[PDB]
Amino acid sequence: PTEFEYLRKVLFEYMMGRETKTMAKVITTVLKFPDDQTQKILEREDARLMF
């Protein structure tokens, strides 16, 4: 309930293109993504920072 509002806030920021790398870590953490998927997201994200 409080985590849902938290989730939406974080997800809103990410989708609008802000501080996307940090938000990605909280999103995979809150929704307990598996290690494989998590690392796949965190890398493309890094490959995104290059710009």
Partner: protein
């Protein structure tokens, strides 16, 4: 160099009120922070990216998601809240173990010092175990977000300590 700071602590400690007290006059127009606030502050002509993370129970578990590349942690503790000072120690102990914060400098704010019943800086330091901290550059300051006292001093110490490194 532009440092990035984290303002952590339990719900109620006064973290948001502090953030806007810095770099801006003051208006504690405040509501429980379900998420986070980020604002850029300039002290002695320097630049800090300051993150204010909500501290209620359910979201405290996600603090570590932000530890990456942290230079300093301003840890806010409610000086009048004696019933929960042990929980503040717990969270504090846990975060310091974090490998990503090893080189971060710690600054404790014994906030709400404008209140008659607020415990002293010495009692808190001992109650939080600060005296035992090894390999840790720290300091405790008594502050008041509403009255705005003790902040300039703390900022001075933080700015100079890290300019050293």
């Amino acid at each position: 160099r532009e440092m990035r700071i984290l303002i952590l602590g339990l719900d109620g400690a006064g973290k948001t009120t502090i953030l806007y007290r810095l770099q801006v006059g003051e208006v504690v127009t405040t509501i429980p922070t379900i998420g986070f606030n980020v604002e850029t502050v300039t002290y002695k002509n320097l630049k800090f990216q300051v993150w204010d993370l909500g501290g209620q129970t359910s979201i405290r578990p996600y603090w570590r998601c932000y530890y990456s590349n942290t230079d300093a942690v301003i840890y806010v503790v409610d000086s009048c809240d004696r019933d929960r000072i042990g929980i503040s120690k717990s969270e504090l102990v846990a975060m310091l173990e974090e490998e990503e914060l090893r080189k971060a400098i710690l600054v404790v704010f014994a906030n709400k010092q404008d209140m008659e019943q607020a415990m002293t800086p010495s009692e808190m330091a001992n109650a939080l175990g600060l005296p035992a901290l090894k390999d840790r550059k720290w300091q405790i300051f008594k502050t008041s977000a509403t009255k705005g006292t003790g902040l300039d001093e703390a900022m001075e110490w933080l700015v100079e300590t890290l300019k050293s490194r």
